[PDB]
PDB file of C-alpha atoms and ligand atoms in Angstrom:
ATOM      1  CA  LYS A   1     -16.042   2.524 -14.028  1.00  0.00           C
ATOM      2  CA  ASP A   2     -12.438   1.457 -13.360  1.00  0.00           C
ATOM      3  CA  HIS A   3     -10.650  -0.559 -10.617  1.00  0.00           C
ATOM      4  CA  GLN A   4     -14.028  -1.509  -9.177  1.00  0.00           C
ATOM      5  CA  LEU A   5     -12.717  -4.356  -6.996  1.00  0.00           C
ATOM      6  CA  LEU A   6      -9.658  -2.367  -5.884  1.00  0.00           C
ATOM      7  CA  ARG A   7     -11.940   0.561  -4.859  1.00  0.00           C
ATOM      8  CA  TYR A   8     -14.333  -1.796  -3.099  1.00  0.00           C
ATOM      9  CA  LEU A   9     -11.423  -3.238  -1.010  1.00  0.00           C
ATOM     10  CA  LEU A  10      -9.877   0.161  -0.375  1.00  0.00           C
ATOM     11  CA  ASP A  11     -13.184   1.806   0.529  1.00  0.00           C
ATOM     12  CA  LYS A  12     -14.592  -1.003   2.646  1.00  0.00           C
ATOM     13  CA  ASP A  13     -14.484  -1.628   6.388  1.00  0.00           C
TER      14      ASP A  13
ATOM     15  CA  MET B   4      21.118   6.930  20.171  1.00  0.00           C
ATOM     16  CA  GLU B   5      17.411   6.156  20.250  1.00  0.00           C
ATOM     17  CA  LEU B   6      14.174   6.641  18.306  1.00  0.00           C
ATOM     18  CA  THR B   7      12.091   9.583  19.531  1.00  0.00           C
ATOM     19  CA  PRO B   8       8.664   8.820  21.056  1.00  0.00           C
ATOM     20  CA  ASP B   9       7.148  10.149  17.831  1.00  0.00           C
ATOM     21  CA  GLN B  10       9.291   7.800  15.725  1.00  0.00           C
ATOM     22  CA  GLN B  11       8.517   4.947  18.107  1.00  0.00           C
ATOM     23  CA  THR B  12       4.793   5.570  17.654  1.00  0.00           C
ATOM     24  CA  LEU B  13       5.164   5.684  13.871  1.00  0.00           C
ATOM     25  CA  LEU B  14       7.189   2.493  13.835  1.00  0.00           C
ATOM     26  CA  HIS B  15       4.715   0.829  16.123  1.00  0.00           C
ATOM     27  CA  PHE B  16       1.721   1.466  13.826  1.00  0.00           C
ATOM     28  CA  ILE B  17       3.736   0.042  10.881  1.00  0.00           C
ATOM     29  CA  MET B  18       4.796  -3.147  12.699  1.00  0.00           C
ATOM     30  CA  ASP B  19       1.333  -3.774  14.062  1.00  0.00           C
ATOM     31  CA  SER B  20      -0.123  -3.531  10.542  1.00  0.00           C
ATOM     32  CA  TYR B  21       2.687  -5.611   8.942  1.00  0.00           C
ATOM     33  CA  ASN B  22       2.241  -8.283  11.598  1.00  0.00           C
ATOM     34  CA  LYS B  23      -1.470  -8.808  10.676  1.00  0.00           C
ATOM     35  CA  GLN B  24      -0.798 -10.198   7.179  1.00  0.00           C
ATOM     36  CA  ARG B  25      -1.357 -13.910   6.553  1.00  0.00           C
ATOM     37  CA  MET B  26      -1.816 -16.398   3.736  1.00  0.00           C
ATOM     38  CA  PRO B  27      -5.126 -18.263   4.220  1.00  0.00           C
ATOM     39  CA  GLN B  28      -4.608 -21.963   5.048  1.00  0.00           C
ATOM     40  CA  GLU B  29      -6.950 -22.695   2.179  1.00  0.00           C
ATOM     41  CA  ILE B  30      -4.223 -21.424  -0.144  1.00  0.00           C
ATOM     42  CA  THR B  31      -1.254 -23.006   1.601  1.00  0.00           C
ATOM     43  CA  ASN B  32      -2.875 -26.443   1.523  1.00  0.00           C
ATOM     44  CA  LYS B  33      -3.049 -26.109  -2.285  1.00  0.00           C
ATOM     45  CA  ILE B  34       0.679 -25.442  -2.445  1.00  0.00           C
ATOM     46  CA  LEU B  35       1.078 -28.820  -0.787  1.00  0.00           C
ATOM     47  CA  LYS B  36      -1.763 -30.826  -2.300  1.00  0.00           C
ATOM     48  CA  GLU B  37      -2.630 -29.636  -5.824  1.00  0.00           C
ATOM     49  CA  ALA B  38      -1.332 -31.316  -8.987  1.00  0.00           C
ATOM     50  CA  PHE B  39       2.157 -30.462 -10.213  1.00  0.00           C
ATOM     51  CA  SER B  40       2.077 -29.016 -13.726  1.00  0.00           C
ATOM     52  CA  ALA B  41       2.968 -25.740 -15.448  1.00  0.00           C
ATOM     53  CA  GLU B  42      -0.773 -24.966 -15.720  1.00  0.00           C
ATOM     54  CA  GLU B  43      -1.648 -25.716 -12.080  1.00  0.00           C
ATOM     55  CA  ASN B  44       1.538 -24.154 -10.817  1.00  0.00           C
ATOM     56  CA  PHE B  45       0.736 -20.923 -12.670  1.00  0.00           C
ATOM     57  CA  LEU B  46      -2.817 -20.946 -11.252  1.00  0.00           C
ATOM     58  CA  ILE B  47      -1.511 -21.306  -7.705  1.00  0.00           C
ATOM     59  CA  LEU B  48       0.898 -18.403  -8.144  1.00  0.00           C
ATOM     60  CA  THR B  49      -2.099 -16.404  -9.417  1.00  0.00           C
ATOM     61  CA  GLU B  50      -4.190 -17.220  -6.338  1.00  0.00           C
ATOM     62  CA  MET B  51      -1.241 -16.243  -4.080  1.00  0.00           C
ATOM     63  CA  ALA B  52      -0.665 -12.960  -5.857  1.00  0.00           C
ATOM     64  CA  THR B  53      -4.386 -12.142  -5.438  1.00  0.00           C
ATOM     65  CA  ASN B  54      -4.408 -12.901  -1.719  1.00  0.00           C
ATOM     66  CA  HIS B  55      -1.260 -10.762  -1.311  1.00  0.00           C
ATOM     67  CA  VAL B  56      -2.788  -7.702  -3.152  1.00  0.00           C
ATOM     68  CA  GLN B  57      -5.637  -7.981  -0.648  1.00  0.00           C
ATOM     69  CA  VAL B  58      -3.252  -8.170   2.310  1.00  0.00           C
ATOM     70  CA  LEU B  59      -1.418  -5.226   0.748  1.00  0.00           C
ATOM     71  CA  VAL B  60      -4.537  -3.006   0.667  1.00  0.00           C
ATOM     72  CA  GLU B  61      -5.237  -3.757   4.356  1.00  0.00           C
ATOM     73  CA  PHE B  62      -1.653  -2.967   5.337  1.00  0.00           C
ATOM     74  CA  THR B  63      -1.596   0.316   3.352  1.00  0.00           C
ATOM     75  CA  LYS B  64      -4.881   1.635   4.859  1.00  0.00           C
ATOM     76  CA  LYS B  65      -3.260   1.433   8.304  1.00  0.00           C
ATOM     77  CA  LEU B  66      -0.118   3.319   7.234  1.00  0.00           C
ATOM     78  CA  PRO B  67      -0.051   6.626   9.095  1.00  0.00           C
ATOM     79  CA  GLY B  68      -1.436   9.411   6.831  1.00  0.00           C
ATOM     80  CA  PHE B  69      -2.208   7.155   3.885  1.00  0.00           C
ATOM     81  CA  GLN B  70      -5.930   7.647   4.257  1.00  0.00           C
ATOM     82  CA  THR B  71      -5.482  11.409   4.290  1.00  0.00           C
ATOM     83  CA  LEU B  72      -4.162  11.306   0.717  1.00  0.00           C
ATOM     84  CA  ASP B  73      -6.299  12.199  -2.294  1.00  0.00           C
ATOM     85  CA  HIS B  74      -8.446   9.143  -3.103  1.00  0.00           C
ATOM     86  CA  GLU B  75      -7.155   8.714  -6.625  1.00  0.00           C
ATOM     87  CA  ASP B  76      -3.496   9.040  -5.554  1.00  0.00           C
ATOM     88  CA  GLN B  77      -4.258   6.191  -3.070  1.00  0.00           C
ATOM     89  CA  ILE B  78      -5.178   4.029  -6.092  1.00  0.00           C
ATOM     90  CA  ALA B  79      -2.184   5.140  -8.147  1.00  0.00           C
ATOM     91  CA  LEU B  80       0.179   4.326  -5.154  1.00  0.00           C
ATOM     92  CA  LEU B  81      -1.231   0.754  -4.841  1.00  0.00           C
ATOM     93  CA  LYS B  82      -1.093  -0.029  -8.571  1.00  0.00           C
ATOM     94  CA  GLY B  83       2.489   1.206  -8.796  1.00  0.00           C
ATOM     95  CA  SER B  84       3.714  -0.680  -5.696  1.00  0.00           C
ATOM     96  CA  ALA B  85       1.979  -4.027  -5.941  1.00  0.00           C
ATOM     97  CA  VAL B  86       4.699  -5.918  -7.848  1.00  0.00           C
ATOM     98  CA  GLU B  87       7.505  -4.415  -5.766  1.00  0.00           C
ATOM     99  CA  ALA B  88       5.810  -5.259  -2.468  1.00  0.00           C
ATOM    100  CA  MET B  89       4.922  -8.738  -3.701  1.00  0.00           C
ATOM    101  CA  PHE B  90       8.612  -9.472  -4.521  1.00  0.00           C
ATOM    102  CA  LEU B  91       9.754  -8.053  -1.138  1.00  0.00           C
ATOM    103  CA  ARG B  92       7.341 -10.300   0.746  1.00  0.00           C
ATOM    104  CA  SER B  93       8.284 -13.327  -1.406  1.00  0.00           C
ATOM    105  CA  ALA B  94      11.891 -12.669  -0.475  1.00  0.00           C
ATOM    106  CA  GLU B  95      11.040 -12.551   3.213  1.00  0.00           C
ATOM    107  CA  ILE B  96       9.140 -15.800   3.273  1.00  0.00           C
ATOM    108  CA  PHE B  97      11.768 -17.646   1.190  1.00  0.00           C
ATOM    109  CA  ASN B  98      14.462 -16.573   3.687  1.00  0.00           C
ATOM    110  CA  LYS B  99      12.426 -17.851   6.656  1.00  0.00           C
ATOM    111  CA  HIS B 105       7.345 -26.708   2.437  1.00  0.00           C
ATOM    112  CA  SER B 106       9.288 -23.828   0.847  1.00  0.00           C
ATOM    113  CA  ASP B 107      10.915 -26.625  -1.135  1.00  0.00           C
ATOM    114  CA  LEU B 108       7.670 -27.474  -2.943  1.00  0.00           C
ATOM    115  CA  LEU B 109       6.815 -23.792  -3.395  1.00  0.00           C
ATOM    116  CA  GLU B 110      10.174 -23.138  -5.013  1.00  0.00           C
ATOM    117  CA  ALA B 111       9.681 -26.142  -7.292  1.00  0.00           C
ATOM    118  CA  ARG B 112       6.252 -24.812  -8.406  1.00  0.00           C
ATOM    119  CA  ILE B 113       7.628 -21.384  -9.169  1.00  0.00           C
ATOM    120  CA  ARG B 114      10.468 -22.903 -11.267  1.00  0.00           C
ATOM    121  CA  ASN B 115       7.791 -24.968 -13.112  1.00  0.00           C
ATOM    122  CA  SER B 116       4.887 -22.576 -13.739  1.00  0.00           C
ATOM    123  CA  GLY B 117       5.680 -21.944 -17.368  1.00  0.00           C
ATOM    124  CA  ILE B 118       7.671 -18.831 -16.557  1.00  0.00           C
ATOM    125  CA  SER B 119      10.919 -18.018 -18.368  1.00  0.00           C
ATOM    126  CA  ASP B 120      14.325 -18.200 -16.699  1.00  0.00           C
ATOM    127  CA  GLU B 121      14.693 -14.671 -17.997  1.00  0.00           C
ATOM    128  CA  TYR B 122      12.406 -13.772 -15.074  1.00  0.00           C
ATOM    129  CA  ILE B 123      13.051 -16.644 -12.644  1.00  0.00           C
ATOM    130  CA  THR B 124      16.779 -16.007 -12.641  1.00  0.00           C
ATOM    131  CA  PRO B 125      16.854 -12.375 -11.456  1.00  0.00           C
ATOM    132  CA  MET B 126      14.004 -13.358  -9.034  1.00  0.00           C
ATOM    133  CA  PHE B 127      15.987 -16.015  -7.174  1.00  0.00           C
ATOM    134  CA  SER B 128      19.073 -13.884  -7.284  1.00  0.00           C
ATOM    135  CA  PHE B 129      17.079 -11.134  -5.452  1.00  0.00           C
ATOM    136  CA  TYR B 130      15.960 -13.645  -2.806  1.00  0.00           C
ATOM    137  CA  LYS B 131      19.619 -14.449  -2.335  1.00  0.00           C
ATOM    138  CA  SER B 132      20.779 -10.851  -1.847  1.00  0.00           C
ATOM    139  CA  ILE B 133      17.848 -10.271   0.520  1.00  0.00           C
ATOM    140  CA  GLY B 134      18.869 -13.283   2.625  1.00  0.00           C
ATOM    141  CA  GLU B 135      22.475 -12.098   2.729  1.00  0.00           C
ATOM    142  CA  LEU B 136      21.257  -8.904   4.396  1.00  0.00           C
ATOM    143  CA  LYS B 137      19.681 -10.754   7.341  1.00  0.00           C
ATOM    144  CA  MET B 138      16.889  -8.225   7.583  1.00  0.00           C
ATOM    145  CA  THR B 139      14.871  -7.685  10.726  1.00  0.00           C
ATOM    146  CA  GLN B 140      11.046  -7.572  10.716  1.00  0.00           C
ATOM    147  CA  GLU B 141      11.183  -3.791  11.179  1.00  0.00           C
ATOM    148  CA  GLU B 142      13.414  -3.483   8.125  1.00  0.00           C
ATOM    149  CA  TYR B 143      11.011  -5.579   6.020  1.00  0.00           C
ATOM    150  CA  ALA B 144       7.962  -3.558   7.214  1.00  0.00           C
ATOM    151  CA  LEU B 145       9.549  -0.105   6.746  1.00  0.00           C
ATOM    152  CA  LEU B 146      10.969  -1.039   3.365  1.00  0.00           C
ATOM    153  CA  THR B 147       7.531  -2.277   2.285  1.00  0.00           C
ATOM    154  CA  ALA B 148       5.918   1.052   3.397  1.00  0.00           C
ATOM    155  CA  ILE B 149       8.705   3.167   1.781  1.00  0.00           C
ATOM    156  CA  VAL B 150       8.071   1.217  -1.450  1.00  0.00           C
ATOM    157  CA  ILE B 151       4.315   1.923  -1.184  1.00  0.00           C
ATOM    158  CA  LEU B 152       4.770   5.600  -0.390  1.00  0.00           C
ATOM    159  CA  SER B 153       6.932   6.336  -3.450  1.00  0.00           C
ATOM    160  CA  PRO B 154       6.057   9.888  -4.496  1.00  0.00           C
ATOM    161  CA  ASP B 155       7.382   9.333  -8.012  1.00  0.00           C
ATOM    162  CA  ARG B 156       4.832   6.864  -9.320  1.00  0.00           C
ATOM    163  CA  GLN B 157       2.877   7.562 -12.518  1.00  0.00           C
ATOM    164  CA  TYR B 158      -0.450   9.405 -12.256  1.00  0.00           C
ATOM    165  CA  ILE B 159       0.076  10.920  -8.803  1.00  0.00           C
ATOM    166  CA  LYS B 160      -1.543  14.372  -8.556  1.00  0.00           C
ATOM    167  CA  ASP B 161      -0.043  15.644  -5.258  1.00  0.00           C
ATOM    168  CA  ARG B 162       3.470  14.218  -4.924  1.00  0.00           C
ATOM    169  CA  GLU B 163       4.549  16.443  -2.083  1.00  0.00           C
ATOM    170  CA  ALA B 164       1.822  14.996   0.159  1.00  0.00           C
ATOM    171  CA  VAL B 165       3.456  11.614  -0.502  1.00  0.00           C
ATOM    172  CA  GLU B 166       6.990  12.930   0.158  1.00  0.00           C
ATOM    173  CA  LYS B 167       5.764  14.082   3.542  1.00  0.00           C
ATOM    174  CA  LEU B 168       4.724  10.496   4.434  1.00  0.00           C
ATOM    175  CA  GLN B 169       7.789   8.733   2.958  1.00  0.00           C
ATOM    176  CA  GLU B 170      10.564  10.984   4.345  1.00  0.00           C
ATOM    177  CA  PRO B 171       9.904  10.169   8.046  1.00  0.00           C
ATOM    178  CA  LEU B 172      10.041   6.420   7.236  1.00  0.00           C
ATOM    179  CA  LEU B 173      13.497   6.727   5.570  1.00  0.00           C
ATOM    180  CA  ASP B 174      14.569   8.736   8.669  1.00  0.00           C
ATOM    181  CA  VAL B 175      13.474   5.974  11.048  1.00  0.00           C
ATOM    182  CA  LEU B 176      15.007   3.235   8.855  1.00  0.00           C
ATOM    183  CA  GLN B 177      18.354   5.020   8.833  1.00  0.00           C
ATOM    184  CA  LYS B 178      18.303   5.497  12.608  1.00  0.00           C
ATOM    185  CA  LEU B 179      17.525   1.839  13.131  1.00  0.00           C
ATOM    186  CA  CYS B 180      20.558   1.004  11.010  1.00  0.00           C
ATOM    187  CA  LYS B 181      22.751   3.299  13.190  1.00  0.00           C
ATOM    188  CA  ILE B 182      21.399   1.838  16.421  1.00  0.00           C
ATOM    189  CA  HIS B 183      21.503  -1.836  15.404  1.00  0.00           C
ATOM    190  CA  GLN B 184      24.558  -1.949  13.116  1.00  0.00           C
ATOM    191  CA  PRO B 185      26.722   0.893  14.524  1.00  0.00           C
ATOM    192  CA  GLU B 186      29.893  -0.756  13.137  1.00  0.00           C
ATOM    193  CA  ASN B 187      28.662  -1.334   9.558  1.00  0.00           C
ATOM    194  CA  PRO B 188      27.989   2.225   8.243  1.00  0.00           C
ATOM    195  CA  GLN B 189      27.048   0.755   4.871  1.00  0.00           C
ATOM    196  CA  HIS B 190      23.923  -1.124   6.094  1.00  0.00           C
ATOM    197  CA  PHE B 191      21.463   1.623   5.131  1.00  0.00           C
ATOM    198  CA  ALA B 192      23.115   1.839   1.682  1.00  0.00           C
ATOM    199  CA  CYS B 193      22.618  -1.887   1.114  1.00  0.00           C
ATOM    200  CA  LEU B 194      18.883  -1.546   1.949  1.00  0.00           C
ATOM    201  CA  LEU B 195      18.592   1.199  -0.707  1.00  0.00           C
ATOM    202  CA  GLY B 196      20.301  -1.115  -3.164  1.00  0.00           C
ATOM    203  CA  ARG B 197      17.326  -3.362  -2.585  1.00  0.00           C
ATOM    204  CA  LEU B 198      14.932  -0.489  -3.375  1.00  0.00           C
ATOM    205  CA  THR B 199      16.572   0.013  -6.813  1.00  0.00           C
ATOM    206  CA  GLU B 200      16.791  -3.725  -7.447  1.00  0.00           C
ATOM    207  CA  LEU B 201      13.008  -3.974  -6.656  1.00  0.00           C
ATOM    208  CA  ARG B 202      12.200  -1.473  -9.439  1.00  0.00           C
ATOM    209  CA  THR B 203      13.718  -3.755 -12.087  1.00  0.00           C
ATOM    210  CA  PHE B 204      10.986  -6.307 -11.429  1.00  0.00           C
ATOM    211  CA  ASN B 205       8.350  -3.971 -12.840  1.00  0.00           C
ATOM    212  CA  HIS B 206       9.621  -4.263 -16.405  1.00  0.00           C
ATOM    213  CA  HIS B 207      10.243  -8.002 -16.028  1.00  0.00           C
ATOM    214  CA  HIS B 208       6.747  -8.528 -14.643  1.00  0.00           C
ATOM    215  CA  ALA B 209       5.233  -6.480 -17.466  1.00  0.00           C
ATOM    216  CA  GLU B 210       6.881  -8.710 -20.050  1.00  0.00           C
ATOM    217  CA  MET B 211       5.752 -11.891 -18.270  1.00  0.00           C
ATOM    218  CA  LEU B 212       2.189 -10.519 -18.431  1.00  0.00           C
ATOM    219  CA  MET B 213       2.444  -8.788 -21.800  1.00  0.00           C
ATOM    220  CA  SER B 214       4.228 -11.632 -23.616  1.00  0.00           C
ATOM    221  CA  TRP B 215       2.359 -14.904 -22.737  1.00  0.00           C
ATOM    222  CA  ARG B 216      -1.151 -14.304 -24.099  1.00  0.00           C
ATOM    223  CA  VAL B 217      -2.023 -18.011 -24.319  1.00  0.00           C
ATOM    224  CA  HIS B 220      -4.104 -16.235 -19.287  1.00  0.00           C
ATOM    225  CA  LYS B 221      -7.117 -14.956 -17.344  1.00  0.00           C
ATOM    226  CA  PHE B 222      -5.758 -14.215 -13.862  1.00  0.00           C
ATOM    227  CA  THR B 223      -8.199 -12.794 -11.309  1.00  0.00           C
ATOM    228  CA  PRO B 224     -10.290  -9.594 -11.307  1.00  0.00           C
ATOM    229  CA  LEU B 225      -8.059  -7.960  -8.685  1.00  0.00           C
ATOM    230  CA  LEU B 226      -4.818  -8.604 -10.642  1.00  0.00           C
ATOM    231  CA  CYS B 227      -6.308  -7.443 -13.986  1.00  0.00           C
ATOM    232  CA  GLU B 228      -7.106  -4.010 -12.445  1.00  0.00           C
ATOM    233  CA  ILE B 229      -3.801  -3.407 -10.635  1.00  0.00           C
ATOM    234  CA  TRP B 230      -1.768  -4.522 -13.664  1.00  0.00           C
ATOM    235  CA  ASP B 231      -4.067  -3.170 -16.425  1.00  0.00           C
ATOM    236  CA  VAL B 232      -4.583  -6.523 -18.158  1.00  0.00           C
TER     237      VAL B 232
HETATM  238  C1  643 C 301       5.607 -16.630  -2.789  1.00  0.00           C
HETATM  239  C2  643 C 301       4.601 -15.879  -3.609  1.00  0.00           C
HETATM  240  C3  643 C 301       4.707 -15.882  -4.976  1.00  0.00           C
HETATM  241  C4  643 C 301       3.792 -15.193  -5.738  1.00  0.00           C
HETATM  242  O1  643 C 301       3.920 -15.222  -7.077  1.00  0.00           O
HETATM  243  C5  643 C 301       3.043 -14.440  -7.870  1.00  0.00           C
HETATM  244  C6  643 C 301       3.677 -14.234  -9.215  1.00  0.00           C
HETATM  245  C7  643 C 301       5.014 -13.858  -9.502  1.00  0.00           C
HETATM  246  C8  643 C 301       6.047 -13.600  -8.478  1.00  0.00           C
HETATM  247  C9  643 C 301       6.899 -14.604  -8.048  1.00  0.00           C
HETATM  248 CL1  643 C 301       6.791 -16.161  -8.758  1.00  0.00          CL
HETATM  249  C10 643 C 301       7.824 -14.328  -7.071  1.00  0.00           C
HETATM  250  N1  643 C 301       7.900 -13.131  -6.544  1.00  0.00           N
HETATM  251  C11 643 C 301       7.110 -12.154  -6.912  1.00  0.00           C
HETATM  252  C12 643 C 301       6.160 -12.353  -7.881  1.00  0.00           C
HETATM  253 CL2  643 C 301       5.128 -11.076  -8.389  1.00  0.00          CL
HETATM  254  N2  643 C 301       5.102 -13.801 -10.793  1.00  0.00           N
HETATM  255  O2  643 C 301       4.056 -14.078 -11.309  1.00  0.00           O
HETATM  256  C13 643 C 301       3.110 -14.362 -10.422  1.00  0.00           C
HETATM  257  C14 643 C 301       1.682 -14.739 -10.702  1.00  0.00           C
HETATM  258  C15 643 C 301       0.910 -13.495 -11.123  1.00  0.00           C
HETATM  259  C16 643 C 301       1.623 -15.764 -11.831  1.00  0.00           C
HETATM  260  C17 643 C 301       2.770 -14.492  -5.134  1.00  0.00           C
HETATM  261  C18 643 C 301       2.662 -14.485  -3.767  1.00  0.00           C
HETATM  262  C19 643 C 301       3.586 -15.167  -2.991  1.00  0.00           C
HETATM  263  C20 643 C 301       3.450 -15.181  -1.519  1.00  0.00           C
HETATM  264  C21 643 C 301       3.203 -14.029  -0.776  1.00  0.00           C
HETATM  265  C22 643 C 301       3.061 -14.101   0.579  1.00  0.00           C
HETATM  266  C23 643 C 301       3.154 -15.326   1.228  1.00  0.00           C
HETATM  267  C24 643 C 301       3.060 -15.764   2.628  1.00  0.00           C
HETATM  268  C25 643 C 301       2.811 -14.949   3.815  1.00  0.00           C
HETATM  269  O3  643 C 301       2.663 -13.760   3.725  1.00  0.00           O
HETATM  270  O4  643 C 301       2.721 -15.540   5.009  1.00  0.00           O
HETATM  271  C26 643 C 301       3.242 -17.107   2.621  1.00  0.00           C
HETATM  272  N3  643 C 301       3.441 -17.536   1.367  1.00  0.00           N
HETATM  273  C27 643 C 301       3.671 -18.924   0.993  1.00  0.00           C
HETATM  274  C28 643 C 301       3.395 -16.487   0.491  1.00  0.00           C
HETATM  275  C29 643 C 301       3.537 -16.404  -0.882  1.00  0.00           C
END
């Protein structure tokens, strides 16, 4: 599990 | 000499997205009201950098074709462009309160080794008198750099970046028809931006003594 926050922001709406 | 409808559409999506960015008033009030000390000053810069990385993700997602790229290459493009985009934006704001911000930067426990080239870049940016379109397109061209580390499909990136360099050049020809070197000076800013990556790495690497934010730790592998 890497860049969890970054992925959350990128993958959110 | 004019942009084609297709180029006008592309430029329009970029400007619209660039124009949405903002620094929350919660943060700006701190620049004005918080204590003045190397420790506090460093913490404020940290909060600003974090808010910017967020603004940067929102801007990138709206860049034409970005979301059609491989999901991991999207991550790699953001991690490799964050410092560069953050310096470009800093430049912009500094060249258009700022007094206190400048003072905090110069007193945040950061070496002149870094501060010096930083303020010199702000100067050369200012001397260019860049338009908002120039700042937005340069920011996107910096983000869509096909040569970053860990990118799996570089050609898919080239396809997105090329059309932006084409529009930026045309804008230079239409708005500065008598100064054929204008485009060239913008590229000089692209190469100058890259030098901040090493500098930034040393600022991070070499002052372990310190916790940043979760967002910054991931983008900069802290
Ligand atoms: C103006 C600044 C500085 C900043 O510093 C963040 C840092 C830098 C460093 C330095 Cl000092 C200068 N340039 C680039 C780097 Cl990257 N070096 O280390 C750090 C932190 C991690 C300690 C981070 C973010 C902003 C910033 C961004 C956008 C806006 C903005 C708007 O968009 O409307 C309004 N304001 C006042 C802004 C401030």
